[PDB]
């Protein structure tokens, strides 16, 4: 049982040690498309790249590249697209990806500005009457409604394909209270947020995979997917304590590098799953 594993690692202060063994054991696959000189300006960070085998391709003939990965969790029957916070020049590619993959939800785990720098382009409209048009990808995005709560904001958006005049409703889930440094003290509001995403139908197999991002698409984004998958496997299995969070993280790391950026994010992921298991058992 992970709860006893938690106390052992905590009492021995072994988090940095566990974390390094995960780093050591993590998969390494080629990222040749990401490294092509012409894709430099499509990448936020030079050391955060999608693997070629799991990368999302845009259906545009010129350049199919976006910094996004498909994470397929076969036993849990859950998929996720993890991506970076869009750049000023990739906002149109972002929405094209949402469209092409039939996603119903976008999960954002960062503020546009943190530590006095921009972590992400403002890629959705701030007012109903001021819609956004992405001329490069022929999409229009309208804010329909915005529900602001203490720890998160939910937005209903309308995405229109200007080429075919089809429209879809997209839900934007914006977790607004992740602190600038470290991790939340309590996983309560994060779990509350994760259950709200689940309740929306955004994680359901009827729809395309949910799009999840922070700034790099590996740290906070990693914590979200890791907690969701671990809780789902505990519902599914004959023995819920067969779930090993380290094995699940390593399976997820076959699809995108660097998921869970610090030993504190790892400790927080354990705390979230342990606390979430109480509300599921
Ligand atoms: O216009 C832009 C200029 C640079 C960047 C960041 N690129 C980071 C790097 C990726 C690969 C090698 S260096 C984004 C937009």
Numbering used by the authors: 2 to 282
Paper text:
Previously, several authors of the current study performed a crystallographic fragment screen of the archetypal protein tyrosine phosphatase, PTP1B (also known as PTPN1), a highly validated therapeutic target for diabetes, cancer, and neurological disorders that has also been deemed ‘undruggable’. Here, we have performed two RT crystallographic screens of PTP1B using many of the same fragments, representing the largest RT crystallographic screens of a diverse library of ligands to date, and enabling a direct interrogation of the effect of data collection temperature on protein-ligand interactions. We show that at RT, fewer ligands bind, and often more weakly – but with a variety of temperature-dependent differences, including unique binding poses, changes in solvation, new binding sites, and distinct protein allosteric conformational responses. We see fragments bound in all three previously reported surface allosteric sites in the PTP1B catalytic domain: the BB site, the 197 site, and the L16 site.
